């Protein structure tokens, strides 16, 4: 099982690489996300300011 | 050497590989969290200055 076992170990290394690579794609996206939900955060704060203005 | 000793070494190592990556991925995405909040806090702060 020595010459079955390496072949399995090579596969594990390739796998360790793909799981870490999904996270790094995730991270970039996570950064993009932060700008989108902040784009939405301004125009919801904008309608909040018109709220206490129209109240005035 | 013996088949039992090599199979014991196979499970242990491909485990080490799988675990270290899961934690590795987990650190990468934990940081992804950190940058999301810090980056949002900043970006929001500026636009809200203009709004105010």
């Amino acid at each position: 099982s020595q010459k079955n076992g390496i072949a399995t170990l090579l596969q594990a290394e390739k796998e360790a690489h793909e799981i870490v690579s999904k996270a790094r794609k995730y991270r970039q996206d996570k950064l993009k996300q932060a700008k989108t939900d902040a784009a939405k955060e301004i125009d919801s704060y904008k309608i909040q300011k018109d709220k206490e203005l129209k109240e005035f | 050497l013996t088949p039992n000793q090599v199979n014991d070494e196979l499970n242990k190592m491909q485990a080490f590989i799988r675990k270290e990556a899961e934690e590795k991925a987990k650190e990468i995405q934990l940081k992804a969290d950190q940058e999301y909040e810090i980056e949002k806090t900043n970006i929001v702060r500026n636009e809200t200055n203009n709004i105010d």
Binding site: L10, A12, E13 | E9, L10, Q14, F16
Partner: peptide
């Protein structure tokens, strides 16, 4: 027998290739 036992005992699952 010495290169095969040594790369497996330290983890680091990327085996060497020994050709003749």
């Amino acid at each position: 027998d010495s290169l095969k036992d040594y790369i497996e005992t330290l983890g680091s699952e990327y085996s060497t290739v020994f050709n003749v």
